[PDB]
Amino acid sequence: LSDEDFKAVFGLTRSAFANLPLWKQQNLKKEKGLF
């Protein structure tokens, strides 16, 4: 996943998402369907 594609999936860029707490990251990707 590129930054823009990732941003399309999560609504956040990789750095912005990685800026989040890991539990929320795992939660978000879970909800997105990215295990």
Domains of the chain with bracketed CATH: 3-32 (1.10.950.10)
Could you tell me the CA-to-CA distances from 17 to 24, 26 in Å, in that order? 9, 10
Nearest one of 12, 30, 19 to 1, comparing CA atoms = 12
> How far is Cα of residue 22 from the mean position of the Cα atoms in its chain?
10
Alpha helical stretches, state H, 1-35: 3-10, 14-18, 22-32
Nearest one of 21, 18, 23 to 10, comparing CA atoms = 18
Q: Under a CB-based contact definition with an 8 Å cutoff, are residues 9 and 1 in contact?
A: yes
Could you tell me the CA-to-CA distances from 24 to 28, 29 in Å, in that order? 6, 8
Q: How was this structure determined?
A: NMR
Beta-carbon contacts of 21 under 8 Å, excluding residues fewer than 6 positions away, are none
Q: What burial letters (b/e) apply to 23-32, b meaning 16+ CB within 10 Å?
A: eeeeebeeee
